Curated annotation (Swiss-Prot), chain B:
It is an enzyme of class 7 (translocase). The keyword Cell membrane does not apply. Its EC number is 7.1.1.2. One of its GO terms (molecular function) is NADH dehydrogenase (ubiquinone) activity. It comes from Arabidopsis thaliana. One of its GO terms (cellular component) is mitochondrial inner membrane. NCBIfam families: NDH_I_N. GO terms for biological process: ATP synthesis coupled electron transport. InterPro entries: NADH-Q_OxRdtase_suN/2, ND/Mrp_TM. It catalyses: a ubiquinone + NADH + 5 H(+)(in) = a ubiquinol + NAD(+) + 4 H(+)(out). The lineage of its organism: Eukaryota, Viridiplantae, Streptophyta, Embryophyta, Tracheophyta. This is NADH-ubiquinone oxidoreductase chain 2. Signal peptide: none annotated. Pfam families: Proton_antipo_M. Keywords: Electron transport, Membrane, Mitochondrion, Mitochondrion inner membrane, NAD, Respiratory chain, Translocase, Transmembrane, Transmembrane helix, Transport, Ubiquinone.
UniProtKB/Swiss-Prot annotation, chain D:
One of its GO terms (cellular component) is mitochondrion. Accessory subunit of the mitochondrial membrane respiratory chain NADH dehydrogenase (Complex I), that is believed not to be involved in catalysis. Complex I functions in the transfer of electrons from NADH to the respiratory chain. The immediate electron acceptor for the enzyme is believed to be ubiquinone. The keyword Transferase does not apply. It comes from the Eukaryota. It is found in: Mitochondrion inner membrane. It is a single-pass membrane protein. This is NADH dehydrogenase [ubiquinone] 1 alpha subcomplex subunit 1.
Curated annotation (Swiss-Prot), chain H:
Belongs to the complex I 23 kDa subunit family. The chain holds residues 58 to 111 of 222 of the full protein. The lineage of its organism: Eukaryota, Viridiplantae, Streptophyta, Embryophyta, Tracheophyta. Complex I is composed of at least 49 different subunits. This is a component of the iron-sulfur (IP) fragment of the enzyme. Core subunit of the mitochondrial membrane respiratory chain NADH dehydrogenase (Complex I) that is believed to belong to the minimal assembly required for catalysis. Complex I functions in the transfer of electrons from NADH to the respiratory chain. The immediate electron acceptor for the enzyme is believed to be ubiquinone. May donate electrons to ubiquinone. It comes from the Eukaryota. Transmembrane segments: none annotated. It is found in: Mitochondrion. This is NADH dehydrogenase [ubiquinone] iron-sulfur protein 8-A, mitochondrial.
From Swiss-Prot, chain I:
Complex I is composed of at least 49 different subunits. This is a component of the iron-sulfur (IP) fragment of the enzyme. Disulfide bonds join 13-43, 23-33. The keyword RNA-binding does not apply. Coiled coil: none annotated. It comes from Arabidopsis thaliana (Mouse-ear cress). This is NADH dehydrogenase [ubiquinone] iron-sulfur protein 5-B. The chain holds residues 2 to 65 of 83 of the full protein.
Length: 94, 488, 101, 58, 100, 324, 174, 54, 64, 43
């Protein structure tokens, strides 16, 4: 059921009203650094890893050994990539 | 449980070997102890070994690839057709890699990750050939495309390489989105993505008045994506720019391997499927447009790489004529044409890579080559006459089937277009022979002799080109075998 | 996980075991299987050594090539042994140790 | 014992949190007649709608 | 009329991607972003169709497509960065050297 | 639904009072550590100090500099403040004391945390200051870097619970609190929260004396106040999350009738207060890392250990068949 | 009606993505399209996908775009162009696509006209499937890692390619 | 050097032990009396030599 | 056609799909399986049910 | 003599070594202990 999402919408509306009241009451009286792109790339990869973990973590009780090892292989590929990142100096900001 | 994975021993091995090579390259390229050695050639040799071992594993275990077919059914489907297609793909990858060592050493391209990306794209094309569902097909296509986008921009400081990478990325992402839209439309209209389920639902009705417009447009958009992939007009303009701008080994790999993988995909998605002649008309009109545009644009070219690119566009048109006619002999001739074009293209790119040590850029740079290297000038001329389709060379089969299907399927406009385009192609191919043999330029260019790898590959391909028609039976029989494995 | 070894094309030789275990397949290795394995491992080590001289890492390159060769050689031998035991390959030897034992 | 001065704002925050819980707890119970049920699923919703008929039409 | 409205939502997103391609000859960053809009429209179609047909195959592909979209955006922005670095500008007059 | 806004305000207004008094509590605790008094003149024991400060900010003239992004400059503090507020709609204080019993509450919280970075980056670019922009870039990169470790720790708790419902996560700790067998995970989570909140030792925006200008240097009056209230509300929320995931939430320490007498809201508040005290005690105890050092810690220490703990916990649970 | 509201918000936000003079503004309007899409997904009952669109598209992808486009400092002159001359071609292409493609489901999925009669009592309710309900998360997780795990692993290969390409193309170690 | 002394520093690093003393000594003055003068009711000390208003 | 329902049970149209598939598994003329095929498609899209109900609505509107 | 290289690696990179051991335990339990328990149960 999506019924519990309606209070969240009303909550957002009220929070926006409070923010506008607070911010509106006083009105009455050329350098590219590649390392930011790189940190974004790594964040994107590991964000997708957390995404694929949520269905797996709630489903471990039914997938048993097969699902565990399929996730392990997924992690293995992504960790080979991470090791490549480490060795190439992508994790060093010095 | 373990024995179920005998169906995927080749892919498991090649993926694991690629991981090993990645780790080896990264560990020793960063090493101060060994003075940060270039490892492109070391990793390249080890990867050629890995490709050959994968080919042995696939070729020897021919029946075992079909094991546990029910268990693997919803992921892929392996049969005779995929077996021979994958063997051909692995051989093409091995030859392309073998032609790269002089480029690594003399240019000093020290990036070993180039080899790793080639290996990963080879894994992707392997999965493309065995794909039997829209989801798997799309994912394998995308792995392949991402590897190609990265390697096309491998000379990251070059204006040409970066430009080619950018154009490639933008247009390829556009076409991939179009194809994905087609898949979504098909899924919504039929509630299925497996190729067998699609075969059952579509068979028997085609356009029977009450036609599912969703299925029609899904087929249309998927066909647009496929036509982009095979460089067919009017979804072709990326190919000449990308082919020219990429590093020459990248161009060599792109001109052969991805065609085999996507034609396997085309044959399994549509021939194995069922719809009206609409799709056959699509490929017919694209074939005619491709022959005309390829011929004229190749006639306009002054540079070798662009000429080869437009020649490839014309030849895919010739090949797609065989798909359009919708017969068993059509599929057989398509496979024969793909095989012969792959071998001829590898011959031509071995010659181009040999001449790139002296930075060959223009056709005029080949002046007086019959004097400065007579055997090489003859080898390139044999290839050019094979390209033009002159008998008894191997390139004559494509011309022969083009005209055979037309006078059988009843087409006469197609015969006229074939005649005119064949004559135009002969002109712009023999222009290269005239440049190497007839011209007497004031200034010559003396080319460095090629390495042993390219000479051996050139000798073997030249013998095949001159002599295939003397003993052509194995190719004919194996292509006929594959054509029937698709249906029965 | 429901599993099914049923192959698309039926075996053409007597089926000694339709789904042989890992240890059984390994124990079924013949002298030809060990010959194929040793040849692939030796060729791989040789290629690693020869390709590693120019960068200066012939030792580590030998190790990497040998790892690739050990993996591929075991895979090829296991393939052959399992295919013999399942009847996909000519297996007169396996049938001898089945009729007798 | 001067450090009790610091335990006053902390106690105020704790009380604010207790209010954040209990105030919303009692408003819901007053309006719905019973306290909020954690885990209201498709089955609990089907029961409530059917009970409405089973009660009102009797 | 629910399904048709969901589908026309996805339709307008796809059409806006096509229009962004058509309208941004001099702005290749927005060409990339228009392609991302087209990919979102297809991802939504799979989810809507999966709900409509009571079938889970649409959702599996929706997740895998999100992975593809992420990878393609990463590599595309990398190619953008290197092109910009080589030329010092993003103007399309400096990425037209290959022609003919 | 007519009574829903009453509950929403009963959540929001006490939260704002709690934030205003958390700032006072931090000033009082840091002072007492330093042998001083801290606010003690404006009201008895300084208790009216937050009211005076908020009223001062309300009356202060807003500058709104002559930038070319006036709408985005003003919307940036509103975005971060609304995001800080909306996370409390799914927080349970006791059994049944929660506004929205989301079945996907854990992933919803992760989504809110991921969204938090936009207020900071938009403030930097819209402020027309190179110093504010480079500070905002560094802060955003640090936040996303520690989001990965936060997400992996959340996955570990999820494997133990097998449900994204926060109330179920609490009720799964009836047998034992997760902070006992996952104590190193709790420590990593508390440090990742510190770094995610831009708090000492990770408070780059406070490192003005380090030639490191904050993202909100060009903000005055209530835009600055909104940024500050958002950060302190996030500190309270992180304390609440540490309480819920690892300290049993509203559960008593021991399952005995003597402990079961006092309400679970009091238990929850006590635990949240203990973590809020740690946030201040750590601010008072240590110096701060450089940006490069904390980035190295995020990618080279906390990510590998979080991934290792996910693997270890899942493997042990599937091995002995102890899964939920 | 709610679908009309979300459709209008998405339409205007997408127009702003493709027509904003400042690309940074285009990225921020793209975030608004993704939020709107998430609302639509919540209406579909797919909460996991609605949250994952926020986590991935806004939390990761849009942040990548924003980081890159902000550090470019693009001047309006390099990307500006008057678009009035594209009204006819866009009109033709959009009208063709609209007529062929906004009504592609009408013949296959004929809508049910809302009668002036309570057709909501004809809702049959089966309690058997409501005894133990699966979330969208559990239904997806039941399939990803066992029955379709090969596609999962291929997606991992795609991500690995992304990482390697990002390094080889942009890395300049100090 | 030695597996025990290697283990000794590995645990000390992982468990943040030296930061425990930093917390401990920061808490001791918390419960102690403050040195703040209640100005203007209380004043700081001065000497007969103090140089102030002429 | 896959049978995996979005709520963890058998899909709504899976039985129709199967019956269509068993029919086509031995009928050499696809026209022998037309009825089951249109039953499966009707389960997918409810086209004929909605068309008939729209006819009822149209007649009611005409007679009002 | 690869017995003090591991010692130096543990001294220099304690976090990495701890992560490797924790994940290694997590991988070793289902690969080894779980089949041992499965085999014991059947008999
Ligand atoms: C030095 O660091 C510090 C700050 O930032 C640097 C602070 O902002 C602050 C204080 C800032 C605040 C207390 C802001 C408080 C605002 C609130 C609690 C929400 C509104 C409360 C009010 C009393 C204002 C009421 C406004 C209205 C328009 C009336 C509507 C009813 C402190 C104490 C501090 O130490």
């Amino acid at each position: 059921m999506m019924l519990e999402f309606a209070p969240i919408f009303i909550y957002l509306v009220i929070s926006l009203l409070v923010s506008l009241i607070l911010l509106g009451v006083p009105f009455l009286f050329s350098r590219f650094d590649i390392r930011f792109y790189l940190v974004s790339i790594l964040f994107l990869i590991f964000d997708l890893e957390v995404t694929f973990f949520f269905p797996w973590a709630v489903s471990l009780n039914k997938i048993d050994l097969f699902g565990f090892w399929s996730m392990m292989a997924f992690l293995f590929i992504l960790t080979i990539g991470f090791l490549y990142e480490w060795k190439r100096g992508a994790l060093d900001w010095e | 449980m373990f024995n179920l994975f005998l169906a995927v021993f080749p892919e498991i091995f090649i993926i694991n070997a690629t991981f090993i090579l990645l780790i080896h390259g990264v560990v020793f390229s960063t090493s101060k102890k060994y003075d940060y050695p270039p490892l492109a050639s070391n990793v390249g040799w080890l990867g050629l070994l890995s490709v050959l071992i994968t080919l042995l594993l696939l070729a020897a275990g021919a029946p075992l690839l079909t094991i546990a077919h029910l268990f693997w059914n919803n992921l892929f489907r392996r049969d005779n057709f995929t077996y021979f297609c994958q063997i051909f793909l692995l051989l093409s990858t091995a030859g392309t890699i073998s032609m790269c060592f002089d480029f690594f050493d003399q240019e000093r391209f020290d990036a070993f990750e180039f080899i790793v990306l080639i290996l990963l794209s080879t894994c992707g094309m392997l999965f493309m050939i065995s794909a039997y569902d829209l989801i798997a097909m799309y994912l394998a296509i995308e792995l392949q495309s991402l590897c190609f986008y990265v390697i096309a921009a491998s000379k990251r400081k070059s204006e040409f390489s970066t430009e080619a990478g950018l154009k490639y990325l933008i247009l390829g992402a556009f076409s991939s989105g179009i194809l994905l839209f087609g898949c979504s439309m098909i899924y919504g209209s039929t509630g299925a993505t497996h190729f067998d389920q699609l075969a059952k639902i579509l068979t028997g009705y085609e356009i029977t008045g009450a036609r599912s417009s969703g299925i029609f447009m899904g087929i249309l958009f998927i066909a647009v994506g496929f036509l982009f992939k095979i460089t067919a007009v009017p979804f072709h303009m990326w190919a000449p720019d990308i082919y020219e701008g990429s590093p020459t080994p990248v161009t060599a790999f792109l001109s052969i391997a991805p065609k085999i993988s996507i034609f396997a995909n085309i044959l399994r998605v549509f021939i194995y499927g069922s719809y009206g002649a609409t799709l056959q008309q699509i490929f017919f009109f694209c074939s005619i447009a491709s022959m005309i545009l390829g011929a004229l644009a190749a006639m306009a070219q002054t540079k070798v790489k662009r000429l080869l690119a437009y020649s490839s566009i014309g030849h895919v048109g010739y090949i797609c004529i065989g798909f359009s006619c919708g017969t068993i002999e059509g599929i057989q001739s398509l496979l024969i044409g793909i095989f012969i074009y792959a071998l001829m293209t590898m011959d031509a790119f071995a010659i181009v890579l040999a001449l790139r040590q002296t930075r060959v850029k223009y056709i005029a740079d080949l002046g007086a080559l019959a004097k400065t290297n007579p055997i090489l000038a003859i080898t390139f001329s044999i290839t050019m006459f094979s390209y033009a389709g002159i008998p008894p060379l191997a390139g004559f089969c494509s011309k022969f089937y083009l005209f055979f299907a037309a006078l059988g399927c009843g087409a006469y406009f197609l015969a006229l277009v074939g005649v005119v385009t064949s004559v135009i192609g002969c002109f712009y191919y023999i222009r290269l022979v005239k440049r190497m043999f007839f011209d007497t330029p004031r200034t010559w260019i003396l080319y460095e002799p090629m390495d042993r790898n390219k000479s051996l590959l050139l000798a073997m391909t030249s013998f095949f080109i001159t002599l295939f028609l003397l003993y052509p039976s194995p190719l004919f029989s194996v292509t006929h075998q594959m054509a029937l494995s698709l249906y029965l | 996980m429901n599993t099914d070894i049923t192959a698309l094309e039926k075996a053409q030789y007597p089926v000694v075991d339709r789904n042989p275990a890992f240890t059984k397949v390994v124990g079924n290795f013949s002298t030809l299987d060990y010959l194929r394995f040793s040849t692939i491992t030796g060729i791989s080590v040789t290629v690693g050594y020869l390709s590693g001289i120019k960068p200066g890492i012939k030792g580590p390159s030998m190790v990497t090539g040998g790892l690739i060769g050990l993996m591929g050689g075991f895979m090829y031998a296991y393939q052959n042994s399992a295919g013999r035991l399942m009847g996909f390959f000519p297996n007169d030897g396996e049938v001898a140790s089945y009729q007798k034992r | 014992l001067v450090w009790l001065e610091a335990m006053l704002p902390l106690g105020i925050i704790g009380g604010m949190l207790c209010i954040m819980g209990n105030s919303q707890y009692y408003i819901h119970k007053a309006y719905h007649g019973r306290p909020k049920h954690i885990g209201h699923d498709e089955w609990d919703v089907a029961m409530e709608r059917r009970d409405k008929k089973v009660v009102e039409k009797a | 009329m629910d399904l048709i409205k969901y589908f026309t939502f996805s339709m307008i997103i796809f059409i806006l991607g096509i229009w962004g391609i058509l309208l941004n000859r001099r702005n290749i960053l927005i060409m990339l972003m228009s392609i991302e809009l087209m990919l979102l429209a297809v991802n939504l179609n799979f989810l809507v169709f999966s709900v409509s047909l009571d079938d889970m195959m649409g959702q599996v592909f929706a997740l895998l497509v999100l992975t593809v979209a992420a990878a393609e955006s990463a590599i595309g922005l990398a190619i953008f960065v290197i092109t910009f670095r080589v030329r010092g500008t993003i103007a399309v007059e400096f990425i037209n050297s290959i022609q003919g | 639904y007519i009574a829903v806004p009453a509950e929403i305000l009963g959540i929001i207004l006490p939260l704002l009072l709690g934030v205003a008094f958390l700032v006072l509590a931090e000033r009082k605790v840091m002072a007492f550590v330093q042998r001083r008094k801290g606010p003690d003149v404006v009201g008895s024991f300084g208790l009216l100090q937050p009211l005076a400060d908020g009223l001062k900010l309300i009356l202060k003239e807003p500058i709104s500099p002559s930038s070319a992004n006036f709408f985005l400059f003003r919307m940036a503090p509103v975005a971060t403040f609304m995001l800080s507020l909306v996370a409390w709609a799914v927080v349970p204080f006791d059994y049944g004391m929660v506004l929205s019993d989301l079945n996907i509450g854990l992933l919803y919280l992760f989504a809110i945390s991921s969204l938090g970075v936009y207020g900071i980056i938009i403030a930097g670019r819209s402020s027309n200051s190179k110093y504010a922009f480079l500070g905002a870039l560094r802060s955003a990169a640090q936040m996303v870097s520690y989001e990965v470790s936060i997400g992996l720790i959340l996955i570990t708790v999820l494997i133990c619970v097998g449900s994204c419902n926060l109330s179920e996560i609490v009720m799964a700790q009836k047998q034992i609190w997760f902070g006992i067998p996952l104590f190193p995970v709790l420590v990593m989570f508390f440090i990742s929260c510190l770094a995610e909140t831009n708090r000492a030792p990770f408070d780059l925006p406070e490192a003005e004396a380090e030639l490191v200008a904050g993202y909100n240097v060009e903000y005055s009056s209530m835009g600055f106040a909104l940024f500050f209230l958002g950060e302190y509300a996030n500190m309270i929320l992180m304390s609440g999350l540490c309480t819920l995931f690892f300290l049993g939430g509203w559960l008593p320490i021991l399952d005995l009738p003597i402990f079961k007498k006092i309400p679970g809201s009091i238990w929850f508040s006590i635990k949240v207060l203990f973590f809020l005290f740690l946030y201040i005690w750590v601010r008072a105890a240590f110096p701060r890392y450089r940006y490069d050092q904390l980035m190295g810690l995020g990618w080279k220490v906390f990510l590998p250990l979080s991934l290792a703990w996910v693997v270890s916990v899942s493997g042990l649970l599937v091995t002995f068949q102890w899964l939920p | 009606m709610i679908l009309s509201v979300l459709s209008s918000l998405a339409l205007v936000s997408g127009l702003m993505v493709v027509r904003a003079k400042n690309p940074v503004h285009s990225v921020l309007f793209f975030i608004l399209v993704f939020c709107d899409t998430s609302g639509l997904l919540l209406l579909l009952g797919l909460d996991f996908f609605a949250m994952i669109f926020l986590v991935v598209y806004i939390g990761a992808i849009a942040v990548l775009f924003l980081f890159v486009v902000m550090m470019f400092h693009i001047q309006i002159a390099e990307i500006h162009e008057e678009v009035l001359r594209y009204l006819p071609v866009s009109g033709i292409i959009g009208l063709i696509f609209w007529w062929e493609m906004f009504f592609i489901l009408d013949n296959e999925s004929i809508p049910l006209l809302p009668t002036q009669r309570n057709t909501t009592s004809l809702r049959y309710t089966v309690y058997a499937g409501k005894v133990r309900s699966w979330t969208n998360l559990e239904t997806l997780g039941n399939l990803l890692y066992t029955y379709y795990f090969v596609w999962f692993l291929v997606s991992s290969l795609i991500l690995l390619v992304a990482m390697i390409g990002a390094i080889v193309l942009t890395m300049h170690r100090t | 050097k030695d597996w025990n002394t290697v283990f000794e520093r590995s645990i000390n690093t992982l468990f943040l032990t030296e930061m425990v003393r930093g917390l401990s000594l920061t808490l001791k003055y918390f419960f102690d009396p403050k040195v703040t003068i209640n100005y203007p009711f209380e004043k700081g000390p001065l000497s007969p030599r103090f140089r102030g208003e002429h | 056609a896959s049978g995996w329902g979005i709520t963890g049970n058998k899909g709504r149209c899976y039985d129709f799909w199967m019956d269509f598939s068993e029919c086509m598994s031995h009928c050499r003329e696809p026209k022998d399986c037309t009825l089951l095929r249109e039953d499966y498609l009707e389960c997918l899209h409810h086209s004929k049910e909605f068309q008939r109900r729209n006819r009822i609505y149209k007649e009611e509107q005409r007679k009002l | 003599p690869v017995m003090e290289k591991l010692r130096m690696f543990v001294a220099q990179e304690p976090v990495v070594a701890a992560s490797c051991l924790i994940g290694g335990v997590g991988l070793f339990l289902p690969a080894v202990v779980r089949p041992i328990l499965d085999s014991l149960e059947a008999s």
